[PDB]
Design a protein around this ligand. Structure first.
Ligand SMILES: [K+]
Ligand SMILES: [Mg+2]
Ligand SMILES: [Mg+2]
Ligand SMILES: [Mg+2]
Ligand SMILES: [Mg+2]
Ligand SMILES: [Mg+2]
Ligand SMILES: [Mg+2]
Ligand SMILES: [Mg+2]
Ligand SMILES: [Mg+2]
Ligand SMILES: [Mg+2]
Lengths: 63, 97, 25, 214, 127
RNA sequence: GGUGAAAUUCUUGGAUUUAUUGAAGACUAACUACUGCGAAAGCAUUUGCCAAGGACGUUUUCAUUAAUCAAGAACGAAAGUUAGGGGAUCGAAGAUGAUCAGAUACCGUCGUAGUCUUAACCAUAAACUAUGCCGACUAGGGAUCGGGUGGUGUUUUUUUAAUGACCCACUCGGCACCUUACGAGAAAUCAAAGUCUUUGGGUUCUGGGGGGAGUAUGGUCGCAAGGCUGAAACUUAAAGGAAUUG
RNA sequence: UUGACAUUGUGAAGAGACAUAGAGGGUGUAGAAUAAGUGGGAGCUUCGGCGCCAGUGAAAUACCACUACCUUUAUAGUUUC
RNA sequence: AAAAAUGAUUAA
């Protein structure tokens, strides 16, 4: 199974209708030059590792 | 009363200009009154710049741009918050930024 | 009432007054 | 199960000799059979190729070229000049406000019966130490410029037929001569032929193509 | 040393067309649209549907010969919006991600010198 | 395909999407501006032809020939009317799918008339700068368009000549801006809406509380649609303007 | 009006039907392999390999199923568009 | 760019 392990390096902001989703920037563990912006449900610090079922989508709801 | 000296448009000396259509709603609006913006973008997003630069056969690619002139009716410019309604003294300011 | 629709309604009324006077003369 | 990509012959595309490297690309059609098969279905094909690809230089990134397949022999498609035009981004970048656009247009033919429409564009220029903001022309300069540009374009055509016309069109020398002619009326920024379209062509004349290929 | 085709990404609203052709464009190689990857019927123009279509073309781009592609991004054009749809960037990015090589990206939307009165009436589409 | 989302619709009798052509009618992007022309309505592809016009220059000519104008004329957006042509697109009516309590509305898909043109009508618009026209005077600036004048000015030619294009200083006319009103105004605001109880440069038109009513009648014009001219009875204490606070 | 025969002679290039046989699974979810069906039912083979059971589905899988269309294929020929 | 109609009379 291609599950992707990514480390957050930046929390972009708190998004969502009710503010329940986090905008974060994550680089990949296997190669740290593959940054991507994702949506995270629960609470996050920096230096936390996520798991990505599909590793190719960019997170909407910017600025 | 009268809200603006130049009523809502830019037409003093001719009487009729021509209509154009709003990009959003296709409403007819005089060209001098229509809100005009110049959308100049890099043809590829800043996210995909590194991706396509690595996937490009030609070293030192040009990275072309897209150019577009957008015409808005007053309702669609306000709704899409392009003009952003101002105050009585702020209405006179004609500077862009 | 909007003035132009008062105007339009009056124009239909004047049409109908013209036709009823046309029956007489 | 049909799998149409199991029956295609992988032909090559060859450009006229009036360029640098003759390689263009790769093309393919269908298998050959009875009932008037794809021997001639390969004829009417226009290949759009950038002139930077045909001339090995980045300064020809715009100015894309239309090539038309004329005669097929072996694993090669001989092509001939079919047209030329600018890329949309280059056009849009040239067209800016607070300047006048000058457009000329001529329908002329070469020494042979290659009738074709040459376009031309120019934009007025702010000269040095100009305090003024827009630099518009006076609409009589515009007509004078359009007159002399039309004269130059018909001068460059009707002599120096299509082979040498292309060989002059690539080095961007026609609009150079236009600049020398028009510099006494109103200074200009971007003088470009911007388009050539081919209107009518004569009998096929296999010999001219085989002269231009090989 | 690489075989060149044309991408011809027609990213409208309501849908995205990822339609690879040969250099001439007379024949086609793997025309897949965003609406046959999803069943949402309102996500046909989505970047996700465009990305799945752009991976499907790359799948058919291999084992058929094409290795590099020329990008012709297209909006609806004409009298309609002539701005690219949401899926155009995703389709191009997925093509770049899928190992297809990229050259000659150009915008080929149909732009008229004024013609053919626009739909919507004089007062517009009123919402 | 299309929408918040859908469904009417089309599609293995190949729709959508490609490429090469062809036809048709309409339109003239970007350039396009607090720019230009026109009495106004209006006017934006090239070139040719025809007549017209403002401004400027003038040590040319006439010598009051002028200003504004009841009656009377010409032109006059769009829609609309009659006849022929055209009939792509968009689309009053209509069909039809949604939404809805109902929707013969908005949204979607079609679509007759129209949209274009000729020959005739019509003569109305928030036809607006809601500011009549002519003339004089009163404030501080920057630009800009058209013409003309001047240069211990530059630019491409002869690397040292006009001219063209920029610069500076002016000047006449024009579209308009910015600051402040000294003045005016009920104020908003206004370089005219100033030079008005310190009330008079010339002249045309219009209004007299709100409704009834731009109605009735008569006349007149129009094929019609309708236009122009246009009351009274009756009814009523406000209707209205600008600005302040909520 | 439509078909056939006769009038009615001379010819070619793409299709397509008859008969023998070899092939063939084409999918969405998911057993344990990519499931085109319905009846029967736990065995021969150097492999205990497979089916029985228990999980899996709209439906069982070894085997007998030259059986049922459906989709292809090479014939000495014989027939039609 | 989903839908959202109504609110009896008088009383600084
Ligand atoms: K008020
Ligand atoms: Mg108001
Ligand atoms: Mg008007
Ligand atoms: Mg097709
Ligand atoms: Mg001009
Ligand atoms: Mg009136
Ligand atoms: Mg009035
Ligand atoms: Mg009034
Ligand atoms: Mg009264
Ligand atoms: Mg109440």
């Amino acid at each position: 199974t291609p599950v992707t392990l990514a480390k957050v390096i930046k929390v972009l902001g708190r998004t969502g209708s009710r503010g329940g989703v986090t905008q974060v920037r994550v680089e990949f563990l296997e190669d740290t030059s593959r940054t991507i912006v994702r949506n995270v449900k629960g609470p996050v610090r920096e230096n936390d590792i996520l798991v990505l079922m599909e590793s190719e989508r960019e997170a909407r709801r910017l600025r | 009363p009268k809200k603006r000296a130049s009523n809502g448009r830019n037409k003093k000396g001719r009487g009729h200009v021509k209509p154009v259509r709003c990009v959003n709603c296709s409403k007819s609006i005089p060209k001098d009154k229509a809100i005009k913006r110049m959308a100049i973008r890099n043809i590829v997003e800043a996210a995909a710049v590194r991706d396509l630069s690595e996937a490009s056969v030609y070293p030192e690619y040009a990275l072309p741009k897209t150019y577009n002139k957008l015409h808005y009716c007053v309702s669609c410019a306000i709704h899409a918050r392009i003009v952003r309604v101002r105050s009585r003294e702020d209405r006179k300011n004609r500077a862009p930024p | 009432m909007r003035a132009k629709w008062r105007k339009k309604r009056t124009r239909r009324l004047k049409r109908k007054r013209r036709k009823v006077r046309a029956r007489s003369k | 199960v049909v799998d149409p990509f199991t029956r295609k012959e992988w032909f090559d595309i060859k450009a006229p000799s009036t360029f640098e490297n003759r390689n263009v690309g790769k093309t393919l059609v269908n298998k050959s059979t009875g009932l008037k098969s794809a021997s001639d279905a390969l004829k009417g094909r226009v290949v759009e190729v950038c002139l930077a690809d045909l001339q090995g230089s980045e300064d020809h990134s715009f100015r894309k070229i239309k090539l038309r397949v004329d005669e097929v022999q072996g694993k090669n498609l001989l092509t001939n000049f079919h047209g030329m035009d600018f890329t949309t981004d280059k056009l849009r970048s040239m067209v800016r406000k607070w300047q006048t656009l000058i457009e000329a247009n001529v329908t002329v033919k070469t020494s042979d019966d290659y009738v074709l429409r040459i376009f031309a564009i120019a934009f007025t220029r702010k000269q040095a130490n100009q305090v003024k903001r827009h630099s518009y022309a006076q609409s009589s300069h515009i007509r004078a410029i359009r007159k002399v540009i039309s004269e130059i374009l018909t001068k460059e055509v009707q002599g120096s037929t299509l082979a040498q016309l292309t060989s002059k069109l690539i080095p961007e020398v026609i609009n150079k001569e236009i600049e020398n002619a028009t510099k006494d009326i109103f200074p200009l920024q971007n003088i470009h032929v911007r388009k050539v379209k081919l209107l009518k062509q004569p009998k096929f004349d296999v010999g001219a193509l085989m002269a231009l290929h090989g | 040393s690489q075989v060149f085709g044309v991408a011809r990404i027609y990213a409208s609203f309501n849908d995205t067309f990822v339609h690879v052709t040969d250099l001439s464009g007379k024949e086609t190689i793997a025309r897949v649209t965003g609406g046959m990857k999803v069943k949402a019927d309102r996500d046909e123009s989505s970047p996700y549907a465009a990305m799945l279509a752009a991976q499907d073309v790359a799948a058919k781009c291999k084992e058929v010969g094409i290795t590099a592609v020329h990008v012709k991004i297209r909006a609806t054009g004409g009298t309609r919006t002539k701005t690219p749809g949401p899926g155009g960037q995703a389709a191009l990015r997925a093509l770049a991600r899928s190992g297809l090589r990229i050259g000659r990206i150009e915008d080929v939307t149909p732009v008229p010198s004024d013609s053919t009165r626009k739909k919507g009436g004089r007062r517009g589409r009123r919402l």
